[PDB]
Amino acid sequence: LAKIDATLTKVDMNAAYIFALRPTFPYSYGYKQRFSNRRLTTSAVCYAR
Amino acid sequence: LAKIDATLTKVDMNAAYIFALRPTFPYSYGYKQRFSNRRLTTSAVCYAR
Amino acid sequence: ASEPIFNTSINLTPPYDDTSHTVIQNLSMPQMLSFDPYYESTFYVVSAD
Numbered sequence: 001l002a003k004i005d006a007t008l009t010k011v012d013m014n015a016a017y018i019f020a021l022r023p024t025f026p027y028s029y030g031y032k033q034r035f036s037n038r039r040l041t042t043s044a045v046c047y048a049r
Numbered sequence: 050l051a052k053i054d055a056t057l058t059k060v061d062m063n064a065a066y067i068f069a070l071r072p073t074f075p076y077s078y079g080y081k082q083r084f085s086n087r088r089l090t091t092s093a094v095c096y097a098r
Numbered sequence: 099a100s101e102p103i104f105n106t107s108i109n110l111t112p113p114y115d116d117t118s119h120t121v122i123q124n125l126s127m128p129q130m131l132s133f134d135p136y137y138e139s140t141f142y143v144v145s146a147d
Binding site for chain 2: 100102103112118132136
């Protein structure tokens with residue numbers, strides 16, 4: 001599943017570099033407590049490298 | 050349904066006293082308002098004596 | 099507290115909630131349905147404005 005569409009290398013060298021050597025790995029995260037009325041993060045999205 | 054397992058009286062006198070003479074009666078409670086963005090208690094647990 | 103023991107180390111303050119700091123609780127029986135022991139009359143819950 002590692003495809004970067006070689007045509008891109010003929011139009012955007014820098015974008016191809018960034019996409020090829022620095023993968024993103026998006027993920028969602030949240031916190032959960034039991035007896036708190038405080039509002040914490042639930043479905044935030046980050047990108048791990 | 051008032052059972053305290055008499056064997057306990059031979060190992061833990063103080064725990065038997067506490068369980069026998071001071072019943073707990075756990076309960077859950079919450080508050081509810083109609084047009085507030087404030088976050089109040091919903092499912093707190095207490096023990097009534 | 100789940101058990102009636104309080105010396106110094108028991109934490110009776112509920113963390114992560116803070117609602118009890120302004121509103122206490124209402125553990126009372128509702129208003130008496132009759133203010134006359136012998137004769138039944140109808141009273142109302144009325145609006146203020």
